[PDB]
Amino acid sequence: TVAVVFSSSGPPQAQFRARLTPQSFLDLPLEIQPLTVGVNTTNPSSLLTQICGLLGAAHVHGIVFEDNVDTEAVAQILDFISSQTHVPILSISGGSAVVLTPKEPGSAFLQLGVSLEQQLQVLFKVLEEYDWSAFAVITSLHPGHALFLEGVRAVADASHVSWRLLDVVTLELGPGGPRARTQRLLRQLDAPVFVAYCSREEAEVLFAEAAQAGLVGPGHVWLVPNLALGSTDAPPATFPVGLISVVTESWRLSLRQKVRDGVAILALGAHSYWRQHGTLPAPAGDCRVHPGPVSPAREAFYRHLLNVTWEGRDFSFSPGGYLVQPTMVVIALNRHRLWEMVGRWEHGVLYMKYPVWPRYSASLQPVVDSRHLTVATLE
């Protein structure tokens, strides 16, 4: 059996029925009976009670999560629960699909996302091809800013080009603080390429401030990881046109499609383990008792659960609860305020739709660099 949980959207009663309906979807050899659960609000006791009750009155083997309005500090509860009751879970979307690096020792979380190292690698593989090498790094006072600042330096020494760094700055971009100081610091900068790391509210504040202090015209280029930019389906105001981010595959699928992948990966994991030993491990769901030392059977099942492949999509989870070797796709903000694909990435080679970077102006009418020319030839 496999459980499914929704959160914080338009009431998916029709979606819940459509997910519960295919009791035999023929998506894998053998199909455990699926069941659905829905929480009204996201809260500690609400979540704890719902999961403990469902997994104690259902005897479930695996459970698949579905995210919410993308608020932080929610994946920690899932890690806590999985570590306590030794049930493998899986996060699929939203803010709960943000990589948690130092997870609990005996936990089995397996949240599908990409660590900052891979995103930075992809970004520097697009900086090298257009040959910018400016490196104006801006980071807010965020919990994970030290990791980003270490990672950028680590990757900078892992390439051929010199990557002459210009300046790194840290500013208080929170809800409350002195705007004049940040205005003064932003007003003094000179670099054609910026890399920024902050939260969505921090992103909007920083972009509004940059628009105030004239750093958003056709002269500069901005780059951000997937942590910012929020919903991906509603770009707010003051977001510069030409923003570049890197998101994983399946950034445009449906909620129902994602759950179909979640149940498929659990089903193949059981089927792959079935060929080895011809069984399905019994559930261990005593939330009230909370027993259990290290168990070898569940450990072996989790070890066999790591690698999976189906429908021509390689899902390989690292020991840390994040997948390794995905096929990221770069996206950018078109001239009409709409996210669009720019360049794929597949086994370490980058592609682009445009041989040169389109540069737009305040009144559009794409400007062309005066000191750039095209040369024709043949062999």
């Binding site: 996201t42 006791s45 704890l48 500090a73 130092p102 929170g174």
Partner: protein, 655 residues
């Protein structure tokens, strides 16, 4: 208003003292404007039931902060986790009273957590201080492989790299294991005589037993451990006379309540005077939103400097941990612990006591027992290092020089004796040659003793980038020397830029260049047959050599090396055999070896003069005591004339 605080306490007798202390602080503080309020709950064993009780408490009041402590259960890891997880959802600050673990200070997971006691990872500071104090610079690090184990190493390595000390080999062991002997056997061969232990109390006992079994606790050896490695099962098996440390007010749980209450009561006034009186959520179900003023309260809480508590002034660090905590150095004399020194904020002050080192000595035991035995690596070459099978009895065959003189030989272990396929067969062989004679003279003239062993890989040595990594690694004789498997390289090693950055060489003892081998117009600048690859002639050399890197550093010779990459040999003998039977076309290498081969093996002629200049040298690790000695000995040998007769004996047999 009536601001309210909460707390989780152990035995509910601490709760009465907590209430009395908070009432006393209410009496002392405040100008009859704001009153503080108290409520507490006892710790229960189930973590999930713990969290349920926590937001039962959270609904029970507009809690402004939480104080958490440990129960009598020794499992100190998971107990203060659930309260942090629950109270971090709404950014309600929580303060840990007497928790010492190194995973709670990662301010990305536990979102709002403070400590009134420094963690275990801060122990490396006193190690560094007392390490400078006693003038020790040769260090062995020995820490467990867990996350807590891997945190002290990072900070100590940061300090030592800041001083560019570059501590010697650090050893990692899996926690909860038996037969830990292998790591200690690997470490005992090293030179440093001070080792640092940091692990769980159980692993300390087995490490102590292994050290006693292997007699690593003999005189001269000096130990120094942490607070968690002395008490418990480890105290019974602990070797006598080892330095240790402890915290002054550890596990008191009475002063910590007081000063935590004091600092919280000091911070609440500064919070409320900021027009941000917005109340915390009342209900663990009611509101799915964070506190609107939690980050501000945490920020003003961290920078709140208290005046004077029972444990003194308290002030927090940018990562949230408590700073400026001062320990008590401990020593073990006759199975009775006695204090020998007191840590200050930065320095360490001894206090009218004498240390008893494990050997019972009275003076400061200097480390680094100097070594006269040192291992020497070598590679097989034709006119420098001959290798031959040993005699049937076990010794070497007794030979003589043509001029009526013995030939000096040594016994050499080494490889599988079969390059292509063999798992492991290290049968000793017999070595002799010109380079070996130089080694014998050097050994005689400086009192040291050698143990010559051949190379494993068989490659001269190059730098390569391992797959799925950018950290370059040295492969071959270079890697063997850098790792520590060798102490000197006595072999025809070429001196160049790529090696001088990590090796201190010696003055050259023989100059040589680069020629080409042709069986009997291949110029040196550029041949169109070489510049433009052909079908018959192949211009390639043995892989992992220096000429390979030299051609990979070129532009048109880069194209030549791209053509060559399909062909790469493994030894000089292979190339000689291939070019002798017309199977090979071109081969470029050193002038001396090629000239010797042409003089010995007829019908083969070298093309062109030495179009390059270089030299051979003895290779050693950077900052080694023997370098100056060896360089002056080589220069004196050059001036004496020894090299002349030696070369007349070996390099040219009057051809």
């Amino acid at each position: 208003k009536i601001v309210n605080i909460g707390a989780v306490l152990s035995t509910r007798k601490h709760e009465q003292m907590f209430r009395e202390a908070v009432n006393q602080a209410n009496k002392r503080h405040g100008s009859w404007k704001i009153q503080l309020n108290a409520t507490s709950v006892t710790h229960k064993p189930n973590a999930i039931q713990m969290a349920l009780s926590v937001c039962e408490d959270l609904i029970s009041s507009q809690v402004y902060a939480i104080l958490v402590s440990h129960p009598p259960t020794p499992n100190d890891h998971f107990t203060p986790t659930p309260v942090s997880y629950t109270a971090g959802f709404y950014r309600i600050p929580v303060l840990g009273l007497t928790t010492r673990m190194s995973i709670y200070s990662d301010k990305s997971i536990h979102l709002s957590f403070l400590r009134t006691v420094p963690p275990y990872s801060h122990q490396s500071s006193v190690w560094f201080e007392m390490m400078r104090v006693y003038s020790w610079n040769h260090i062995i690090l020995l820490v467990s492989d867990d996350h807590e184990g891997r945190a002290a190493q990072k900070r100590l390595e940061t300090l030592l790299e800041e001083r560019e000390s570059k501590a010697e080999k650090v050893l990692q062991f899996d926690p909860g294991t038996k037969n830990v002997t292998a790591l200690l056997m690997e470490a005992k061969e090293l030179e440093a005589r001070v080792i640092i232990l940091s692990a769980s109390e159980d692993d300390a006992a087995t490490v102590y037993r292994a050290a006693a079994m292997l007699n690593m606790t003999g005189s001269g050896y000096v130990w120094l451990v942490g607070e968690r490695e002395i008490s418990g099962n480890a105290l019974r098996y602990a070797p006598d006379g080892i330095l240790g440390l402890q915290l002054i007010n550890g596990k008191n749980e009475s002063a910590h309540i007081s000063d935590a209450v004091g600092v919280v009561a000091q911070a609440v006034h500064e919070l409320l005077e900021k027009e941000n009186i917005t109340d915390p959520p009342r209900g663990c179900v009611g509101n799915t939103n964070i506190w609107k003023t939690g980050p501000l309260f945490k920020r003003v809480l961290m920078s709140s400097k208290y005046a004077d508590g029972v444990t003194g002034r308290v002030e927090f660090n940018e990562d949230g941990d408590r700073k400026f905590a001062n320990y008590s150095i401990m020593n073990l004399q006759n199975r009775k612990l006695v204090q020998v020194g007191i840590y200050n904020g930065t320095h360490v002050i001894p206090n009218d006591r004498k240390i008893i080192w494990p050997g019972g000595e009275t003076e400061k035991p200097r480390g680094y027992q100097m070594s006269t035995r040192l291992k020497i690596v070598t590679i097989h070459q034709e006119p420098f290092v001959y290798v031959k099978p040993t005699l049937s009895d076990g010794t070497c065959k007794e030979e003589f020089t043509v001029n009526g003189d013995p030939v000096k030989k040594v016994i050499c272990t080494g490889p599988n004796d079969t390059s292509p396929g063999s798992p492991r067969h290290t049968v000793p062989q017999c070595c002799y040659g010109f380079c070996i004679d130089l080694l014998i003279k050097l050994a005689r003239t400086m009192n040291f003793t050698y143990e010559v062993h051949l190379v494993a890989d068989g490659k001269f040595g190059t730098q390569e980038r391992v797959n799925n990594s950018n950290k370059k690694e040295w492969n071959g004789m270079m890697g063997e020397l850098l790792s520590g498997q060798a102490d000197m390289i006595v072999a025809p090693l070429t001196i160049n830029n790529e090696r001088a950055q990590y090796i201190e060489f010696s003055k050259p003892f023989k100059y040589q260049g680069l020629t080409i081998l042709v069986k009997k117009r291949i110029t040196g600048i550029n041949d169109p047959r070489l510049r433009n690859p052909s079908d018959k002639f192949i211009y390639a050399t043995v892989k992992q050599s220096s000429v390979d890197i030299y051609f990979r550093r070129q532009v048109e010779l880069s194209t030549m090396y791209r053509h060559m990459e399909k062909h790469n040999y493994e030894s000089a003998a292979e190339a000689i055999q291939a070019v002798r039977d017309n199977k090979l076309h071109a081969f470029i290498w050193d002038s001396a070896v090629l000239e010797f081969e042409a003089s010995q093996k007829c019908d083969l002629v070298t093309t062109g003069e030495l179009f390059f200049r270089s030299g051979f040298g003895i290779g050693m690790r950077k900052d080694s005591p023997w370098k100056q000695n060896v360089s002056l000995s080589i220069l004196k040998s050059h001036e004496n004339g020894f090299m002349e007769d030696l070369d007349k004996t070996w390099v040219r047999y009057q051809e």
